[PDB]
Protein backbone atom coordinates (compact mmCIF):
# COMPACT_ATOMS: atom_id res chain seq x y z
CA UNK A 1 0.00 0.00 0.00
CA UNK A 2 2.84 2.36 -0.94
CA UNK A 3 0.36 4.68 -2.62
CA UNK A 4 -2.58 3.78 -0.36
CA UNK A 5 -1.01 4.40 3.04
CA UNK A 6 0.58 7.53 1.52
CA UNK A 7 -2.72 9.27 0.75
CA UNK A 8 -3.77 8.90 4.40
CA UNK A 9 -1.59 11.62 5.87
CA UNK A 10 -1.70 13.45 2.54
CA UNK A 11 -5.17 14.73 3.37
CA UNK A 12 -4.30 15.93 6.88
CA UNK A 13 -1.49 18.19 5.68
CA UNK A 14 -3.81 20.22 3.47
CA UNK A 15 -6.52 19.94 6.08
CA UNK A 16 -4.10 21.71 8.44
CA UNK A 17 -3.55 19.20 11.23
CA UNK A 18 0.04 17.93 10.75
CA UNK A 19 1.33 20.57 13.18
CA UNK A 20 3.85 19.16 15.62
CA UNK A 21 4.44 16.06 13.48
CA UNK A 22 5.95 15.15 10.12
CA UNK A 23 6.78 12.18 7.91
CA UNK A 24 9.40 9.48 8.29
CA UNK A 25 9.65 7.08 5.37
CA UNK A 26 11.73 4.08 6.43
CA UNK A 27 12.30 0.77 4.69
CA UNK A 28 15.00 -1.01 2.75
CA UNK A 29 17.58 1.55 1.61
CA UNK A 30 16.38 2.87 -1.72
CA UNK A 31 13.09 1.03 -2.30
CA UNK A 32 11.78 3.80 -4.43
CA UNK A 33 11.88 5.62 -1.09
CA UNK A 34 13.02 9.05 -2.31
CA UNK A 35 11.11 8.26 -5.51
CA UNK A 36 7.82 7.91 -3.64
CA UNK A 37 8.93 10.74 -1.36
CA UNK A 38 9.34 13.06 -4.35
CA UNK A 39 6.02 11.67 -5.66
CA UNK A 40 4.31 13.09 -2.57
CA UNK A 41 5.40 16.55 -3.72
CA UNK A 42 4.02 15.43 -7.07
CA UNK A 43 0.92 14.36 -5.14
CA UNK A 44 0.83 17.81 -3.52
CA UNK A 45 -0.41 21.12 -4.97
CA UNK A 46 0.70 23.63 -7.57
CA UNK A 47 4.22 24.58 -6.40
CA UNK A 48 5.85 22.25 -3.88
CA UNK A 49 9.66 22.60 -3.70
CA UNK A 50 11.37 19.39 -2.67
CA UNK A 51 14.76 18.45 -1.26
CA UNK A 52 16.46 15.05 -0.85
CA UNK A 53 19.39 15.61 1.53
CA UNK A 54 21.41 13.13 3.55
CA UNK A 55 21.63 12.13 7.19
CA UNK A 56 25.35 12.81 6.96
CA UNK A 57 25.10 15.92 4.77
CA UNK A 58 25.59 17.93 7.97
CA UNK A 59 29.17 16.71 8.62
CA UNK A 60 30.69 19.47 6.52
CA UNK A 61 33.86 21.59 6.53
CA UNK A 62 33.05 24.71 4.52
CA UNK A 63 29.70 25.03 6.33
CA UNK A 64 29.15 24.17 9.97
CA UNK A 65 26.47 21.82 11.30
CA UNK A 66 24.49 24.82 12.52
CA UNK A 67 24.88 26.21 9.00
CA UNK A 68 23.73 22.83 7.69
CA UNK A 69 20.44 23.35 9.52
CA UNK A 70 19.82 26.92 8.38
CA UNK A 71 19.85 26.50 4.60
CA UNK A 72 17.80 23.42 3.69
CA UNK A 73 14.98 24.50 6.00
CA UNK A 74 14.99 27.77 4.09
CA UNK A 75 15.28 25.72 0.88
CA UNK A 76 12.32 23.62 1.98
CA UNK A 77 9.91 26.54 1.95
CA UNK A 78 11.45 29.13 -0.87
CA UNK A 79 13.13 31.81 1.24
CA UNK A 80 16.50 30.35 0.28
CA UNK A 81 16.17 31.38 -3.37
CA UNK A 82 14.97 34.79 -2.25
CA UNK A 83 18.08 34.82 -0.06
CA UNK A 84 20.33 33.33 -2.76
CA UNK A 85 25.48 34.21 7.20
CA UNK A 86 23.19 36.99 8.50
CA UNK A 87 21.44 37.58 5.15
CA UNK A 88 18.29 36.06 6.67
CA UNK A 89 18.19 38.89 9.22
CA UNK A 90 16.69 41.29 6.68
CA UNK A 91 14.45 39.26 4.34
CA UNK A 92 12.72 37.49 7.23
CA UNK A 93 11.87 40.96 8.50
CA UNK A 94 11.08 42.29 5.00
CA UNK A 95 8.62 39.61 3.83
CA UNK A 96 6.75 39.88 7.18
CA UNK A 97 4.23 41.91 5.18
CA UNK A 98 5.22 40.97 1.61
CA UNK A 99 3.26 37.74 2.08
CA UNK A 100 0.23 39.87 2.91
CA UNK A 101 1.16 42.23 0.05
CA UNK A 102 0.42 39.81 -2.76
CA UNK A 103 2.97 39.47 -5.55
CA UNK A 104 3.96 35.82 -5.15
CA UNK A 105 2.31 33.67 -2.51
CA UNK A 106 4.24 31.48 -0.10
CA UNK A 107 4.27 27.71 0.39
CA UNK A 108 5.91 25.37 2.85
CA UNK A 109 8.45 22.85 1.66
CA UNK A 110 8.59 19.11 1.21
CA UNK A 111 11.88 18.44 3.11
CA UNK A 112 13.12 14.90 2.74
CA UNK A 113 16.36 13.89 4.43
CA UNK A 114 17.86 10.52 3.51
CA UNK A 115 18.89 8.09 6.27
CA UNK A 116 18.40 10.17 9.41
CA UNK A 117 20.06 7.51 11.56
CA UNK A 118 23.28 9.10 10.21
CA UNK A 119 22.61 11.98 12.65
CA UNK A 120 23.59 12.84 16.23
CA UNK A 121 21.92 14.24 19.37
CA UNK A 122 22.88 17.87 18.79
CA UNK A 123 21.28 17.90 15.32
CA UNK A 124 17.99 16.27 16.30
CA UNK A 125 17.66 19.13 18.81
CA UNK A 126 17.43 21.83 16.16
CA UNK A 127 14.61 19.94 14.46
CA UNK A 128 12.36 20.76 17.39
CA UNK A 129 13.20 24.46 17.67
CA UNK A 130 12.90 24.90 13.90
CA UNK A 131 9.52 23.17 13.76
CA UNK A 132 8.01 25.68 16.20
CA UNK A 133 7.40 28.14 13.34
CA UNK A 134 4.16 28.54 11.44
CA UNK A 135 6.20 28.63 8.22
CA UNK A 136 7.96 25.48 9.46
CA UNK A 137 6.94 22.90 6.87
CA UNK A 138 6.03 19.27 6.57
CA UNK A 139 9.21 17.19 6.76
CA UNK A 140 10.12 13.71 5.48
CA UNK A 141 12.78 11.33 6.86
CA UNK A 142 14.38 7.94 6.17
CA UNK A 143 16.16 5.09 7.97
CA UNK A 144 16.75 1.35 7.65
CA UNK A 145 17.93 0.64 11.19
CA UNK A 146 16.09 0.13 14.46
CA UNK A 147 17.78 -0.18 17.86
CA UNK A 148 20.86 1.99 17.35
CA UNK A 149 23.32 3.69 19.67
CA UNK A 150 22.86 7.41 19.28
CA UNK A 151 25.83 9.44 18.09
CA UNK A 152 26.70 11.57 21.11
CA UNK A 153 25.80 9.28 24.02
CA UNK A 154 26.14 5.85 25.59
CA UNK A 155 22.42 5.23 25.06
CA UNK A 156 20.68 3.45 22.22
CA UNK A 157 17.36 4.31 20.62
CA UNK A 158 15.26 2.63 17.93
CA UNK A 159 15.29 4.45 14.55
CA UNK A 160 18.25 6.56 15.75
CA UNK A 161 15.73 9.22 16.83
CA UNK A 162 15.01 10.51 20.36
CA UNK A 163 12.18 8.41 21.79
CA UNK A 164 9.95 11.40 22.51
CA UNK A 165 10.20 12.47 18.87
CA UNK A 166 9.44 8.91 17.74
CA UNK A 167 6.02 9.63 19.14
CA UNK A 168 6.13 13.14 17.66
CA UNK A 169 5.97 12.27 13.94
CA UNK A 170 4.32 9.88 11.49
CA UNK A 171 5.91 6.65 10.26
CA UNK A 172 6.02 5.28 6.69
CA UNK A 173 7.79 2.17 5.39
CA UNK A 174 8.13 1.54 1.65
CA UNK A 175 7.07 -1.91 0.52
CA UNK A 176 9.73 -4.05 -1.17
CA UNK A 177 9.24 -5.35 -4.66
CA UNK A 178 8.56 -8.82 -6.05
CA UNK A 179 9.26 -10.64 -9.32
CA UNK A 180 6.53 -8.91 -11.34
CA UNK A 181 7.25 -5.68 -9.49
CA UNK A 182 10.84 -5.86 -10.64
CA UNK A 183 9.48 -6.96 -14.03
CA UNK A 184 7.49 -3.77 -14.45
CA UNK A 185 10.36 -1.60 -13.18
CA UNK A 186 13.05 -2.69 -15.64
CA UNK A 187 10.53 -2.93 -18.49
CA UNK A 188 9.39 0.67 -17.96
CA UNK A 189 13.07 1.50 -17.69
CA UNK A 190 13.80 -0.36 -20.92
CA UNK A 191 11.52 1.60 -23.25
CA UNK A 192 12.46 4.74 -21.34
CA UNK A 193 16.06 3.95 -22.31
CA UNK A 194 15.27 2.43 -25.75
CA UNK A 195 17.85 -0.29 -26.45
CA UNK A 196 16.59 -3.49 -28.07
CA UNK A 197 16.36 -6.49 -25.77
CA UNK A 198 15.02 -9.96 -26.49
CA UNK A 199 12.03 -10.99 -24.40
CA UNK A 200 13.89 -13.53 -22.27
CA UNK A 201 16.45 -10.89 -21.25
CA UNK A 202 13.91 -9.00 -19.16
CA UNK A 203 13.04 -12.23 -17.33
CA UNK A 204 16.43 -13.32 -15.98
CA UNK A 205 17.20 -9.64 -15.26
CA UNK A 206 14.90 -10.13 -12.28
CA UNK A 207 16.81 -13.29 -11.29
CA UNK A 208 19.93 -11.35 -10.27
CA UNK A 209 17.78 -8.51 -8.92
CA UNK A 210 16.29 -10.85 -6.31
CA UNK A 211 19.82 -11.82 -5.22
CA UNK A 212 22.17 -8.88 -5.55
CA UNK A 213 20.86 -5.34 -6.10
CA UNK A 214 18.39 -3.33 -8.18
CA UNK A 215 20.48 -0.71 -10.00
CA UNK A 216 22.96 -3.49 -10.86
CA UNK A 217 20.65 -4.48 -13.71
CA UNK A 218 20.38 -0.89 -14.98
CA UNK A 219 24.17 -0.72 -14.64
CA UNK A 220 24.49 -3.24 -17.49
CA UNK A 221 21.87 -1.69 -19.81
CA UNK A 222 24.41 0.78 -21.21
CA UNK A 223 27.58 -1.34 -21.06
CA UNK A 224 26.20 -4.61 -22.50
CA UNK A 225 24.73 -2.52 -25.31
CA UNK A 226 28.31 -1.64 -26.27
CA UNK A 227 29.57 -5.21 -26.27
CA UNK A 228 26.49 -5.84 -28.40
CA UNK A 229 27.80 -2.89 -30.38
CA UNK A 230 31.14 -4.72 -30.33
CA UNK A 231 29.60 -7.47 -32.47
CA UNK A 232 27.19 -4.95 -34.07
CA UNK A 233 24.25 -7.16 -33.18
CA UNK A 234 21.90 -4.32 -32.14
CA UNK A 235 20.13 -6.52 -29.55
CA UNK A 236 21.84 -7.75 -26.38
CA UNK A 237 21.18 -11.49 -26.58
CA UNK A 238 21.59 -14.09 -23.84
CA UNK A 239 25.36 -14.13 -24.51
CA UNK A 240 26.22 -10.73 -23.01
CA UNK A 241 23.70 -11.45 -20.28
CA UNK A 242 25.79 -14.46 -19.33
CA UNK A 243 29.19 -12.92 -20.18
CA UNK A 244 29.71 -9.79 -18.11
CA UNK A 245 28.29 -11.50 -15.00
CA UNK A 246 31.76 -12.93 -14.40
CA UNK A 247 33.20 -9.43 -14.90
CA UNK A 248 30.62 -7.46 -12.88
CA UNK A 249 29.50 -8.59 -9.42
CA UNK A 250 28.26 -6.95 -6.21
CA UNK A 251 30.36 -6.37 -3.10
CA UNK A 252 28.68 -8.78 -0.68
CA UNK A 253 29.77 -11.50 -3.05
CA UNK A 254 33.23 -10.00 -3.54
CA UNK A 255 34.02 -9.11 0.07
CA UNK A 256 32.88 -12.64 0.93
CA UNK A 257 35.30 -13.89 -1.74
CA UNK A 258 38.13 -12.15 0.06
CA UNK A 259 36.56 -13.52 3.26
CA UNK A 260 36.89 -17.08 1.97
CA UNK A 261 40.37 -15.96 0.85
CA UNK A 262 41.59 -14.30 4.03
CA UNK A 263 41.01 -17.16 6.46
CA UNK A 264 43.24 -19.82 4.88
CA UNK A 265 45.90 -17.13 4.48
CA UNK A 266 45.66 -16.60 8.24
CA UNK A 267 45.48 -20.39 8.68
CA UNK A 268 48.26 -21.96 6.60
Amino acid sequence: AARRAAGVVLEMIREGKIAGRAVLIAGQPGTGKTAIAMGMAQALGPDTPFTAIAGSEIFSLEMSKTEALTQAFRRSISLHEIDVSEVREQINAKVAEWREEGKAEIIPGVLFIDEVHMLDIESFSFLNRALESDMAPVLIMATNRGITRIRGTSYQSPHGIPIDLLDRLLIVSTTPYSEKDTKQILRIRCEEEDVEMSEDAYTVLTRIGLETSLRYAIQLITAASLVCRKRKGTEVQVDDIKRVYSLFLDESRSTQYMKEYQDAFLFN
Binding site: V8, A26, E132, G146, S154, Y155, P162, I163, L166
Partner: protein, 310 residues
Protein backbone atom coordinates in the same frame (compact mmCIF):
# COMPACT_ATOMS: atom_id res chain seq x y z
CA UNK B 1 7.95 48.01 30.04
CA UNK B 2 5.57 47.35 27.14
CA UNK B 3 3.24 44.90 28.83
CA UNK B 4 1.16 43.46 25.98
CA UNK B 5 2.98 40.20 25.23
CA UNK B 6 -0.12 38.18 26.00
CA UNK B 7 0.50 34.80 24.32
CA UNK B 8 3.98 33.26 24.04
CA UNK B 9 3.48 29.50 24.33
CA UNK B 10 4.83 26.38 22.67
CA UNK B 11 1.22 25.24 22.41
CA UNK B 12 1.84 21.92 20.68
CA UNK B 13 3.30 19.98 23.61
CA UNK B 14 0.29 20.83 25.80
CA UNK B 15 -2.11 20.55 22.86
CA UNK B 16 -3.21 17.03 23.87
CA UNK B 17 -3.80 18.16 27.43
CA UNK B 18 -6.45 20.86 27.14
CA UNK B 19 -9.08 18.47 28.53
CA UNK B 20 -7.54 18.02 32.00
CA UNK B 21 -8.70 20.80 34.30
CA UNK B 22 -8.98 19.33 37.79
CA UNK B 23 -7.60 16.68 40.11
CA UNK B 24 -11.04 15.61 41.28
CA UNK B 25 -10.76 15.25 45.05
CA UNK B 26 -13.10 15.76 47.96
CA UNK B 27 -12.57 18.57 50.44
CA UNK B 28 -11.70 16.02 53.12
CA UNK B 29 -8.68 14.45 51.41
CA UNK B 30 -9.68 11.39 49.39
CA UNK B 31 -9.78 10.85 45.62
CA UNK B 32 -12.78 10.62 43.34
CA UNK B 33 -12.78 7.95 40.67
CA UNK B 34 -13.30 10.00 37.51
CA UNK B 35 -13.63 13.78 37.54
CA UNK B 36 -12.16 16.30 35.09
CA UNK B 37 -10.52 13.61 32.99
CA UNK B 38 -8.35 12.07 35.66
CA UNK B 39 -9.13 8.36 35.80
CA UNK B 40 -7.55 5.98 38.25
CA UNK B 41 -4.16 6.75 39.79
CA UNK B 42 -5.70 6.30 43.18
CA UNK B 43 -2.48 6.18 45.14
CA UNK B 44 -1.10 8.91 42.89
CA UNK B 45 -3.50 11.83 42.98
CA UNK B 46 -3.41 12.15 46.77
CA UNK B 47 0.32 12.65 46.40
CA UNK B 48 -0.50 15.71 44.30
CA UNK B 49 -2.91 17.22 46.83
CA UNK B 50 -0.38 16.74 49.61
CA UNK B 51 2.23 18.74 47.69
CA UNK B 52 -0.56 21.25 46.98
CA UNK B 53 -0.69 22.12 50.68
CA UNK B 54 3.07 22.07 51.26
CA UNK B 55 3.22 24.58 48.41
CA UNK B 56 0.46 26.60 50.04
CA UNK B 57 1.74 26.26 53.61
CA UNK B 58 5.20 27.55 52.48
CA UNK B 59 6.88 24.26 53.32
CA UNK B 60 8.34 22.89 50.08
CA UNK B 61 11.59 24.36 51.37
CA UNK B 62 14.47 22.69 49.56
CA UNK B 63 12.86 19.46 48.43
CA UNK B 64 11.92 17.90 45.11
CA UNK B 65 9.29 15.70 43.51
CA UNK B 66 10.19 12.76 41.26
CA UNK B 67 7.69 10.87 39.10
CA UNK B 68 8.60 7.25 38.36
CA UNK B 69 6.41 5.37 35.95
CA UNK B 70 6.70 3.57 32.64
CA UNK B 71 5.86 5.44 29.43
CA UNK B 72 2.12 5.56 28.94
CA UNK B 73 1.35 5.71 32.66
CA UNK B 74 0.55 9.37 32.97
CA UNK B 75 3.78 11.13 33.84
CA UNK B 76 2.92 14.23 31.79
CA UNK B 77 -0.61 14.21 33.22
CA UNK B 78 -0.31 15.06 36.91
CA UNK B 79 2.33 17.69 36.25
CA UNK B 80 -0.16 19.68 34.22
CA UNK B 81 -2.73 19.02 36.92
CA UNK B 82 -0.91 20.75 39.81
CA UNK B 83 -0.80 24.05 37.94
CA UNK B 84 -4.58 23.83 37.54
CA UNK B 85 -5.41 23.82 41.25
CA UNK B 86 -3.00 26.50 42.40
CA UNK B 87 -5.19 29.00 40.59
CA UNK B 88 -5.47 29.23 36.83
CA UNK B 89 -2.90 30.83 34.47
CA UNK B 90 0.14 29.69 36.47
CA UNK B 91 3.08 29.08 34.10
CA UNK B 92 3.66 25.50 33.00
CA UNK B 93 6.38 24.59 30.49
CA UNK B 94 7.54 21.09 29.51
CA UNK B 95 11.19 20.48 28.71
CA UNK B 96 13.17 17.38 27.80
CA UNK B 97 16.61 16.70 29.25
CA UNK B 98 18.09 16.11 25.79
CA UNK B 99 17.16 19.59 24.48
CA UNK B 100 20.12 21.22 26.25
CA UNK B 101 22.46 19.79 23.57
CA UNK B 102 22.05 22.86 21.39
CA UNK B 103 24.69 23.66 18.79
CA UNK B 104 24.99 27.37 19.52
CA UNK B 105 23.42 28.03 22.95
CA UNK B 106 25.40 27.27 26.08
CA UNK B 107 23.86 24.93 28.66
CA UNK B 108 23.87 27.84 31.04
CA UNK B 109 21.70 29.87 28.72
CA UNK B 110 19.09 27.36 27.51
CA UNK B 111 18.10 26.66 31.11
CA UNK B 112 17.79 30.23 32.42
CA UNK B 113 15.65 31.10 29.43
CA UNK B 114 13.42 28.19 30.33
CA UNK B 115 13.49 28.90 34.05
CA UNK B 116 12.11 32.36 33.40
CA UNK B 117 9.40 30.70 31.32
CA UNK B 118 8.00 29.45 34.63
CA UNK B 119 7.48 32.62 36.69
CA UNK B 120 4.57 34.93 35.88
CA UNK B 121 2.66 38.02 36.96
CA UNK B 122 5.79 36.01 32.49
CA UNK B 123 9.44 36.66 33.03
CA UNK B 124 10.28 35.08 29.68
CA UNK B 125 7.86 37.41 27.96
CA UNK B 126 9.32 40.65 29.29
CA UNK B 127 12.68 39.92 27.68
CA UNK B 128 11.07 39.31 24.28
CA UNK B 129 8.86 42.38 24.40
CA UNK B 130 11.82 44.30 23.03
CA UNK B 131 14.72 42.19 21.68
CA UNK B 132 22.51 41.59 28.84
CA UNK B 133 18.91 42.83 28.46
CA UNK B 134 18.03 40.60 31.44
CA UNK B 135 19.92 43.02 33.67
CA UNK B 136 17.95 45.87 32.13
CA UNK B 137 14.68 44.17 33.05
CA UNK B 138 16.03 43.64 36.54
CA UNK B 139 14.68 47.04 37.56
CA UNK B 140 11.45 46.98 35.52
CA UNK B 141 9.83 44.30 37.65
CA UNK B 142 11.53 45.81 40.70
CA UNK B 143 9.45 48.97 40.56
CA UNK B 144 6.22 47.05 39.98
CA UNK B 145 6.57 44.74 42.98
CA UNK B 146 7.23 47.73 45.22
CA UNK B 147 4.27 49.40 43.54
CA UNK B 148 2.12 46.35 44.33
CA UNK B 149 0.56 46.51 40.86
CA UNK B 150 1.85 43.13 39.62
CA UNK B 151 2.35 40.15 41.89
CA UNK B 152 5.10 37.53 42.12
CA UNK B 153 4.10 33.88 41.83
CA UNK B 154 6.07 30.62 41.51
CA UNK B 155 5.26 28.04 38.89
CA UNK B 156 6.20 24.48 37.92
CA UNK B 157 9.06 23.02 35.85
CA UNK B 158 8.84 19.68 34.10
CA UNK B 159 11.80 17.66 32.88
CA UNK B 160 11.53 14.48 30.82
CA UNK B 161 13.85 11.63 29.75
CA UNK B 162 16.15 13.07 32.35
CA UNK B 163 18.86 10.41 32.20
CA UNK B 164 20.26 12.40 29.24
CA UNK B 165 21.46 15.24 31.47
CA UNK B 166 25.07 15.02 32.62
CA UNK B 167 26.74 15.73 35.95
CA UNK B 168 26.91 19.40 34.95
CA UNK B 169 23.31 20.67 34.76
CA UNK B 170 22.34 19.16 38.12
CA UNK B 171 24.64 21.49 40.01
CA UNK B 172 23.15 24.31 38.04
CA UNK B 173 19.75 22.87 38.90
CA UNK B 174 20.51 22.14 42.56
CA UNK B 175 21.69 25.59 43.61
CA UNK B 176 19.16 27.51 41.49
CA UNK B 177 16.38 25.49 43.14
CA UNK B 178 17.21 27.21 46.42
CA UNK B 179 15.77 30.70 46.23
CA UNK B 180 12.64 31.83 48.04
CA UNK B 181 11.14 32.53 44.60
CA UNK B 182 12.14 29.56 42.46
CA UNK B 183 9.42 27.37 40.95
CA UNK B 184 9.17 23.78 42.07
CA UNK B 185 10.46 21.22 39.58
CA UNK B 186 8.91 17.86 38.70
CA UNK B 187 11.32 15.11 37.66
CA UNK B 188 10.27 12.28 35.34
CA UNK B 189 12.15 9.04 34.64
CA UNK B 190 11.76 5.47 33.59
CA UNK B 191 15.26 4.32 34.51
CA UNK B 192 16.60 1.86 37.03
CA UNK B 193 20.23 1.69 38.09
CA UNK B 194 21.78 3.94 35.48
CA UNK B 195 25.18 5.40 34.68
CA UNK B 196 25.49 9.17 35.00
CA UNK B 197 26.61 10.90 31.82
CA UNK B 198 29.80 12.94 32.20
CA UNK B 199 31.71 10.44 34.33
CA UNK B 200 30.64 6.97 33.01
CA UNK B 201 31.71 5.54 36.37
CA UNK B 202 29.23 6.74 39.01
CA UNK B 203 26.02 4.76 39.10
CA UNK B 204 22.97 5.54 41.18
CA UNK B 205 19.18 5.46 41.00
CA UNK B 206 17.44 7.15 38.08
CA UNK B 207 20.63 8.44 36.47
CA UNK B 208 20.71 11.12 39.13
CA UNK B 209 23.69 12.01 41.36
CA UNK B 210 23.79 10.92 44.99
CA UNK B 211 23.71 14.52 46.19
CA UNK B 212 20.24 15.44 44.91
CA UNK B 213 18.37 12.26 45.70
CA UNK B 214 17.64 12.21 49.45
CA UNK B 215 15.92 15.58 49.21
CA UNK B 216 13.75 14.28 46.36
CA UNK B 217 10.38 12.66 46.98
CA UNK B 218 9.31 9.55 45.14
CA UNK B 219 5.89 8.83 43.63
CA UNK B 220 4.92 5.80 41.57
CA UNK B 221 2.21 5.71 38.96
CA UNK B 222 1.14 2.22 37.98
CA UNK B 223 -0.09 0.75 34.72
CA UNK B 224 -3.66 0.83 33.42
CA UNK B 225 -6.54 -1.58 32.72
CA UNK B 226 -8.57 -1.40 29.46
CA UNK B 227 -11.75 -0.32 31.25
CA UNK B 228 -9.64 2.48 32.64
CA UNK B 229 -8.09 2.97 29.20
CA UNK B 230 -11.39 3.00 27.31
CA UNK B 231 -12.75 6.01 29.19
CA UNK B 232 -9.60 7.98 28.34
CA UNK B 233 -10.26 7.87 24.62
CA UNK B 234 -13.96 8.35 25.30
CA UNK B 235 -12.98 11.55 27.06
CA UNK B 236 -10.80 12.34 24.06
CA UNK B 237 -13.40 11.94 21.30
CA UNK B 238 -15.87 14.28 22.99
CA UNK B 239 -13.13 16.90 23.32
CA UNK B 240 -12.51 16.81 19.58
CA UNK B 241 -16.08 16.48 18.31
CA UNK B 242 -15.51 13.18 16.51
CA UNK B 243 -18.24 10.55 16.75
CA UNK B 244 -17.19 6.96 17.29
CA UNK B 245 -18.54 3.42 17.55
CA UNK B 246 -18.69 1.08 20.52
CA UNK B 247 -16.35 -1.60 19.18
CA UNK B 248 -13.91 1.14 18.19
CA UNK B 249 -13.38 1.72 21.90
CA UNK B 250 -13.13 -2.02 22.37
CA UNK B 251 -10.57 -2.40 19.60
CA UNK B 252 -8.38 0.63 20.22
CA UNK B 253 -7.93 -0.18 23.89
CA UNK B 254 -6.18 -3.43 23.00
CA UNK B 255 -3.23 -1.59 21.46
CA UNK B 256 -3.08 0.37 24.71
CA UNK B 257 -2.47 -2.93 26.45
CA UNK B 258 -0.17 -3.98 23.62
CA UNK B 259 2.27 -1.12 23.06
CA UNK B 260 1.45 1.97 25.14
CA UNK B 261 -1.00 4.85 25.35
CA UNK B 262 0.73 7.64 23.41
CA UNK B 263 0.98 5.41 20.36
CA UNK B 264 -2.75 4.77 20.63
CA UNK B 265 -4.17 8.25 21.05
CA UNK B 266 -2.52 9.86 18.01
CA UNK B 267 -4.35 7.51 15.68
CA UNK B 268 -7.73 9.24 15.84
CA UNK B 269 -7.16 12.26 13.57
CA UNK B 270 -6.21 10.06 10.57
CA UNK B 271 -8.91 7.51 11.40
CA UNK B 272 -11.30 10.41 11.65
CA UNK B 273 -10.07 11.32 8.18
CA UNK B 274 -10.17 7.66 7.19
CA UNK B 275 -13.88 7.86 7.87
CA UNK B 276 -13.95 10.97 5.71
CA UNK B 277 -12.45 8.95 2.88
CA UNK B 278 -15.74 7.07 2.65
CA UNK B 279 -17.69 10.14 3.75
CA UNK B 280 -19.40 8.38 6.65
CA UNK B 281 -19.75 9.85 10.12
CA UNK B 282 -18.83 7.20 12.69
CA UNK B 283 -15.42 5.59 13.01
CA UNK B 284 -16.52 2.07 12.13
CA UNK B 285 -14.33 -0.98 12.70
CA UNK B 286 -12.65 -1.20 9.29
CA UNK B 287 -11.00 2.18 9.81
CA UNK B 288 -9.71 0.92 13.14
CA UNK B 289 -8.21 -2.32 11.82
CA UNK B 290 -6.45 -0.58 8.91
CA UNK B 291 -3.94 1.77 10.48
CA UNK B 292 -1.50 -0.15 12.75
CA UNK B 293 -0.28 -2.32 9.87
CA UNK B 294 0.12 0.66 7.50
CA UNK B 295 1.71 3.08 9.99
CA UNK B 296 4.04 2.03 12.76
CA UNK B 297 5.25 2.85 16.24
CA UNK B 298 8.84 2.91 17.43
CA UNK B 299 8.48 -0.50 19.11
CA UNK B 300 6.97 -2.86 16.52
CA UNK B 301 8.71 -1.02 13.67
CA UNK B 302 12.26 -1.58 14.98
CA UNK B 303 11.23 -5.22 15.38
CA UNK B 304 10.15 -5.50 11.74
CA UNK B 305 12.71 -3.00 10.47
CA UNK B 306 15.76 -4.84 11.80
CA UNK B 307 14.43 -8.36 11.29
CA UNK B 308 13.53 -7.77 7.65
CA UNK B 309 16.84 -5.93 7.35
CA UNK B 310 18.54 -9.31 8.03
Amino acid sequence: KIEEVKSTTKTQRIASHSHVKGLGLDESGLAKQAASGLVGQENAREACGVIVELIKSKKMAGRAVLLAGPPGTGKTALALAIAQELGSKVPFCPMVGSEVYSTEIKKTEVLMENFRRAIGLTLHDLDVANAKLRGEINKVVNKYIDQGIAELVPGVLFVDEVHMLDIECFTYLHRALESSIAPIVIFASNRGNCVIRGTEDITSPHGIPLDLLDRVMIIRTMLYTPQEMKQIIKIRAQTEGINISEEALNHLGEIGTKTTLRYSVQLLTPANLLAKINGKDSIEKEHVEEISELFYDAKSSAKILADQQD
